[PDB]
Amino acid sequence: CPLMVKVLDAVRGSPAINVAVHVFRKAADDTWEPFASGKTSESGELHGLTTEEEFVEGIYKVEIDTKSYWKALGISPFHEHAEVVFTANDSGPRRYTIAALLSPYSYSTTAVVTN
Amino acid sequence: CPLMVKVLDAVRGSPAINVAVHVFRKAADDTWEPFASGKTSESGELHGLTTEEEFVEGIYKVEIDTKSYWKALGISPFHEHAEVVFTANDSGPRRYTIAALLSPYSYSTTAVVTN
Amino acid sequence: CPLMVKVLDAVRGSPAINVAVHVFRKAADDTWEPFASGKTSESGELHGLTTEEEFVEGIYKVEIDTKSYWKALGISPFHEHAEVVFTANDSGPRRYTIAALLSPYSYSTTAVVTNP
Amino acid sequence: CPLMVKVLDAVRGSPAINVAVHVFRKAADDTWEPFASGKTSESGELHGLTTEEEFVEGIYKVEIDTKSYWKALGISPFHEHAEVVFTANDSGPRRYTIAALLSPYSYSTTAVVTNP
Ligand SMILES: O=C(O)c1cc(-c2ccc(F)cc2F)cc(I)c1O
Numbered sequence: 001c002p003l004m005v006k007v008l009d010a011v012r013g014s015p016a017i018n019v020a021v022h023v024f025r026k027a028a029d030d031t032w033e034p035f036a037s038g039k040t041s042e043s044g045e046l047h048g049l050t051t052e053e054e055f056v057e058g059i060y061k062v063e064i065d066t067k068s069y070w071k072a073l074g075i076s077p078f079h080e081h082a083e084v085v086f087t088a089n090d091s092g093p094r095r096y097t098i099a100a101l102l103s104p105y106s107y108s109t110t111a112v113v114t115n
Numbered sequence: 116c117p118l119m120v121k122v123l124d125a126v127r128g129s130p131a132i133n134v135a136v137h138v139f140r141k142a143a144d145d146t147w148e149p150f151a152s153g154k155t156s157e158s159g160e161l162h163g164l165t166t167e168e169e170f171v172e173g174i175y176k177v178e179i180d181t182k183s184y185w186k187a188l189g190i191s192p193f194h195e196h197a198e199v200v201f202t203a204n205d206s207g208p209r210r211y212t213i214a215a216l217l218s219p220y221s222y223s224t225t226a227v228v229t230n
Numbered sequence: 231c232p233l234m235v236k237v238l239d240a241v242r243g244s245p246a247i248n249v250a251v252h253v254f255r256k257a258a259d260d261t262w263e264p265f266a267s268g269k270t271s272e273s274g275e276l277h278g279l280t281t282e283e284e285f286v287e288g289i290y291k292v293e294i295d296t297k298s299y300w301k302a303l304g305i306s307p308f309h310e311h312a313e314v315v316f317t318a319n320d321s322g323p324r325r326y327t328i329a330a331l332l333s334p335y336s337y338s339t340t341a342v343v344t345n346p
Numbered sequence: 347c348p349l350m351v352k353v354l355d356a357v358r359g360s361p362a363i364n365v366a367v368h369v370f371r372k373a374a375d376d377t378w379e380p381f382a383s384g385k386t387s388e389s390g391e392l393h394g395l396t397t398e399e400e401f402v403e404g405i406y407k408v409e410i411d412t413k414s415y416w417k418a419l420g421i422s423p424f425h426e427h428a429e430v431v432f433t434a435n436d437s438g439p440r441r442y443t444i445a446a447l448l449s450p451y452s453y454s455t456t457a458v459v460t461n462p
């Protein structure tokens with residue numbers, strides 16, 4: 001409930017469906033440890049990645065597999081994937097939404113943090 | 116239900132609340148006639164602008180009063196407002212979401228059309 | 231020049247070439263008066279729209295004709311055009327770059343404003 | 347040059363100056379090897395990172411140090427950095443411009459790819 005991911009398609013004007021998303025947490029030795037993953041729904045959303053109990057302060061990476069998404073549509077893309085890296089802080093609001101708007105040679109990403 | 120507007124703030128990482136939004140429809144004589152309006156909610160959303168019965172094919176303009184939003188926050192903005200102009204077509208999906216992501220000197224806008 | 235427009239294509243990863251651009255200025259009577267127009271070059275840039283002398287204080291609208299652009303590529307896009315409306319030169323002369331990044335159902339626009 | 351990076355500030359309406367940028371290339375062993383680095387100029391541009399000879403086929407990562415940028419302006423931003431990962435030169439040499447538009451809680455990036 002603390003972390004949700006939403007992906008939109010700027011070519012078709014639609015949610016980006018069945019996009020793979022991987023989340024990692026930074027470990028003591030500076031490597032990225034798998035944390036959570038899933039595929040976006042028909043609404044372009046990925047819910048249920050983690051819980052309040054598990055989502056402690058730390059540095060997290062969200063990797064969105066944009067290349068496979070475009071290839072499935074028959075479109076040649078530029079990026080291998082989209083990556084969003086951020087620090088989770090207990091000071092700020094409690095719910096994080098990471099959103100990405102996708103085009104073949106561009107993407108935009110923003111965070112909405114509420115509560 | 117056919118038309119919803121969502122506004123986000125890229126400086127604060129939050130919904131853009133209490134932003135004025137005006138919708139117009141293009142008339143026969145080429146002028147813009149008021150159609151619907153409102154202010155975004157605490158979630159940054161504006162629901163209930165129109166009905167399926169009233170939202171006929173035509174050219175529509177959505178004007179978002181970004182200047183007043185930034186001025187209320189004490190921030191000097193570039194744009195007078197953000198404007199989104201589009202044709203509604205019965206061919207395509209039935210529900211239109213117009214989203215805008217706001218910064219003082221930039222904005223991005225996208226449309227999600229579903230069903 | 232004091233006003234330049236740059237347009238990029240996010241589907242192709244290229245400048246958006248031959249895009250029509252019309253500029254208007256709000257008149258004393260509150261109507262939009264034609265001010266300048268042109269088309270983007272092979273670099274996606276449009277220079278020479280105006281001069282420091284002619285580009286006085288006022289509210290300006292830069293209308294970028296994205297629909298025509300996309301239709302010629304075989305795409306039926308969402309927007310009729312992209313419109314950028316701003317006050318210019320109200321604290322003295324500035325140089326303005328208006329940039330737009332285009333996709334079929336989305337666009338992003340930003341401005342870079344410098345002082346000579 | 348075959349690889350240029352441009353960075354803009356959406357809060358100020360200006361080039362983003364003195365932004366650190368690090369480039370890496372994926373090694374045969376699947377690790378990220380340092381490839382080039384630099385900082386943006388007063389124009390927000392970073393030129394001279396590499397040459398056509400050195401910029402061979404491979405997977406590259408361009409890491410833009412946005413957090414440090416924002417903190418010096420008194421803003422605590424959301425992202426640690428902005429990272430752009432792409433395959434380059436796999437159909438022969440190309441010229442790449444990587445552009446990034448920055449806000450405290452958002453960034454947009456695009457690429458323009460041309461053939462000389
Ligand atoms: O629900 C959302 O969070 C949402 C977000 C966007 C959006 C995403 C990235 C961006 F740069 C601009 C946007 F409007 C666009 C739409 I349409 C959205 O619905």
Ligand SMILES: O=C(O)c1cc(-c2ccc(F)cc2F)cc(I)c1O
Pocket residue numbers: 236327328329330331338339340341342352354445446447454455456
């Ligand atoms: O010269 C440029 O490459 C340039 C690019 C942008 C820009 C950058 C990223 C983006 F997502 C959208 C833009 F318009 C904005 C401006 I103003 C530019 O001048």
